[PDB]
Design a protein around this ligand. Structure first.
Ligand SMILES: [Zn+2]
Ligand SMILES: [Zn+2]
Ligand SMILES: [Zn+2]
Ligand SMILES: [Zn+2]
Lengths: 349, 348, 349, 349
């Protein structure tokens, strides 16, 4: 008994920041507040303000987002003046998630304007926040508008792109777990959500590329991450884009003091789960190699022992689900993979 | 650009508590947590648990709700185990609103089982909580189920019934303000929401009654309060049930340390607004008199001065709206009413 | 897996016809066609046209509705110019149902402006048409707008009001059959649909009245009939307003050459079913007596034998349902009622 | 003020016919009727029946669809027994559209099982029928389920594949016209609809292929055509997949006694419109050449003069729209293209 809110505004391409005003006019907002990640205003602020003001939209306030702490977010949410019609979030994944959550708490339209794509948070119904010092995924609301400027994304640090590659590829293992879950009568698949998620991913995986900062490559990456969010909205849950691989990453977040980027953790987890599933192994290996994902991850010195533990505790994150990692045998296989596999032996310490 | 979630389960009548298990089976919940207001478990707890367990539904936890403090609610919300499918709230208005808010934060189905009807919180998309020590109305989510046992309601303290009468009669003034707002191009009316809110209220207002603990009376009261909540869900905002009269009450809440029951404040506010509107004055006067609402309110010693200030600050609660009290002249009229009116001179 | 379209426009009261322009402006229609029942334009046409034109809405065409024949309706439907945004139907039940069906076939918004209330056709998702010479209830679409002028209704012939009373009171038995059906696992009740249908009916039944042309009485009658239609739209089927009593009437329609008004047949059927249900008998008897419904019906000379046959064949109209009349014993009881009951002995031949 | 019904069931791939029973079980249908196009039962009937019966679903009737005449369809619609829960249509485009329309008239769930893909009728909310001897597109309802078996499609006659290519490629010009329309304030674009239609098409256009009976090629063709229909359902109108190119085809249908396949007419129209738009010309030329669409069309001897007339009359099909062909200048340009263009000089007489 669930309701679907497909975003009204979807713009991925060139020259978007400059035209943000005309882009969001479709929402009929009279009065907005802009929330910028640190340093972001210095880069794009004036242009964004000019653009919005010239589209005859008033700006109540311009603020900076400094953290993803649940308490500070709730405080700030209720500080938002009652005459505000809409929230605009401009920045990285953390900034987006914070503003998204405020809009959720105040039941306000939210426009997502990410300056990087480290994951699909910028398009989805879930927010990643700090809850009692621990990074945690919590229900929020899907953005009403998503505006991604590929020029801006071109300029982002490569860590965020690798992170995005990791969160995208996870759709392959997530869908497999979802099907396994259904076969075990522990859920029901949403066919359309599967179809779009699958199409987004397969489009990306097939795209030729010279480098990861390639415009065509980035446009495909962003389109798919956007799609993933909408697929979640359509399904009414995270399954289209979140399976065991995600549960592994969430488990890591609960005991590591300094977890790596969500996308990075999810990517490694996806590789692992592919070998456990014995499904789409070559595709996943190829994309994560060819893009330099594995290369990059080696430099981070993630521990085998931390993954082994996350694998064991993955099921605790969503105990009513039934992924491969809700089965003890599959956990042991997963752990044996982490100890044996050649790529892992290389990129993990 | 808004989505409507009409509750799946609606049950108002006799022998509901005992059958709560079969009633909620429709939701297909596998594992629930029960939250009881203080003293409520001692009264209905065992029965409720038995009923639920016999319908093959697992109970993860049974807890007590001790406040409506936003911080504690958030803390408790994120303590709810991940395997929980649904939240059931059993108790008074404060208890219900707390559990409802947790369900909102965790995106979980919520079953509302009120043991009193002091207001339409038990059926609506808004929660009344403490925010920085101040009672404040905040967005939440409409319950997925509402189960009201009229026997339990029969046994509630009269103060909650009077409160309920007050929150119900407010529909009359709210709808008028809403129409005024539309005429001033500051919103658009949702015709269906107007229809059902109007029907619930008119049904109640016409009902003959010996006393306020009359079963037919109570059943009507509860039906309308339930309707009000669904009306709000349908409209996508509070306007079907919340106009200037409510803005008055919310304004009182911001400066009074010890506000009265929402319903009580809203009732008095409704009487005042009727005279300002010069609309349905006799109906409102009659119902609030005949039920003993006014008598009851006299005993509370609410101050004329507090109402006058609330009237002046009502507009600040929702400055983008356009109720009668968003116009200075109508505020002066409202304040002259509080100083003059005979009933008010008596009960304030 | 079903979608709900609550009407955008709902207006029941005084001075509605004159203000039809301003009332429908909310729909943002640019170009409409008006369909009038026979004689209806003579009464209200100029006013309606003036009002619409003065609200800056173009009128493509003004036409007359002459029948409820399915073939003529389809032909006329596809003659509607492609530039037409909306259809307005002004007249009696047959006229409304015809225009409603055209709007259904062309997927056009429909505004219902009934000049009588012989039944809830003016507010519901079903149309009553002639199919192979037989009156038949068929799926259509709920109006987007309903505009009922109580002054116009005041002036309608009494037969239509009695018909309306009959179609309204049927909620009581329909809801009982629906509950019975659920208990037998042959359907699932929609709680909200039950609540509103129940509230509309109970409001009406309790209303004091001097005569059936009383303004307060008519306003209540119209509100309820309107509610009944919306109840059906909400449930996604007819059950909130259509039970065995309806099946009886539909069965009569299949073998009678000259059936009486839907409402009239339904009313008598409702009385019968109340006795079969042994539920709300006194209320139903009281309302149908007090309003003069029974006295009116006596003049029509409906046959006991026709009702007995309709009772036997009721189940054939909807064989997958499970009302009381899907059980042989209850049919026998129904027939014994028609042969015995004092009121029926007086008002039927 | 419009409601979206995304299909519950979407299956495109191998071994689908045989498993139709398990596939449709998700719909919880208790009793269905199967409607087969001519000759189709002989090919797949027994298997389909077995499969359905073994999934514990009753089959009320098995019938043959013999045409797309509106009158015969209405007659047959109302002959469907009241206890039927769902209609299953198995066959070509005409067959599918006929059964779809019956489901529309009886407000019944519909499962689309196409044995060819000559167009996106099998996934969309519109039906192509004969109205007064003229092929005409009319509002229906989107299927509740779509089941396409690529093995079956492999074995279809090439003319349907070429037809499908033609109806698919039209998305490129349709979207351009839609944007033009919006710029002229004559409609509002649905961003998500644009995104999926665009993604389906671009996926197909990029797919390498040996032949048009290539399994990967076909799977992509079918996925996109499926997507086009859902895009239409999402938008609440046909614009995502129907622009001037379609208006041209529909205009041909109104004066030709023997029109060619919708898809074929649409494909040629799409080439023409691309040159008028001066947009995506090379892509469209490449795909229609490389697939052998143009060579195939040459054999049909469509007349230049017919296209010129269709171009002039295109606007009459939907006069309230504002496509390029709602502007006189663009019409002469289109007509000069038909007289001049090298490809057209070759493939048209
Ligand atoms: Zn993720
Ligand atoms: Zn209230
Ligand atoms: Zn009826
Ligand atoms: Zn087409």
């Amino acid at each position: 008994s669930h309701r679907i809110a497909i975003p009204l505004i979807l713009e991925v391409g060139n020259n978007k920041i400059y035209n943000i005003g005309q882009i969001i006019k479709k929402g009929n907002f009279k009065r907005v507040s802009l929330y910028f990640g640190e340093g972001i205003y210095e880069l794009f602020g004036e242009t964004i303000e000019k653009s919005i003001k010239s589209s005859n939209i008033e700006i109540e306030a311009v603020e900076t987002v400094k953290n993803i702490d649940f308490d500070e977010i709730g405080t700030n949410a209720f500080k938002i003046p009652a005459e505000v019609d809409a929230l605009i979030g401009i920045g990285g994944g953390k900034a987006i998630d914070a503003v998204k959550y405020m809009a959720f708490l105040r039941k306000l339209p939210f426009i997502s304007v990410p300056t990087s794509t480290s994951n699909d948070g910028f398009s989805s119904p879930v927010a990643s926040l700090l809850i009692n010092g621990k990074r945690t995924s919590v229900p929020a609301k899907t953005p009403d508008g998503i505006v991604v400027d590929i020029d801006v994304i071109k300029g982002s640090p490569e860590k965020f792109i690798y992170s995005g590659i990791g969160d995208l590829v996870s759709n392959i293992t997530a869908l497999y777990d979802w099907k396994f879950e259904e076969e075990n009568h522990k859920s029901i698949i949403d066919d359309f959500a599967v179809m779009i998620s699958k199409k987004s991913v397969n489009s990306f995986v097939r795209t030729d590329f010279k480098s990861i900062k390639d415009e065509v490559f980035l446009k495909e990456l962003v389109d798919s991450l956007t799609m993933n969010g909408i697929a979640m909205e359509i399904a009414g849950n995270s399954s289209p884009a979140s399976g065991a691989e995600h549960l592994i990453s969430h488990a890591l977040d609960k005991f590591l003091p300094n977890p790596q980027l969500h996308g990075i953790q999810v990517g490694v987890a996806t590789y692992i789960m592919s070998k456990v599933h014995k499904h789409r192994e070559e595709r996943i290996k190829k994309i994560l190699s060819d893009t330099g994902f594995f290369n990059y991850v080696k430099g981070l010195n993630m521990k085998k022992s931390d993954f082994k533990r996350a694998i064991s505790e993955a099921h605790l994150i969503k105990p009513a689900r039934y992924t491969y990692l809700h089965v003890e045998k599959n956990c042991e296989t997963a752990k044996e993979i982490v100890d044996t596999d050649e790529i892992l032996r290389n990129i993990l310490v």
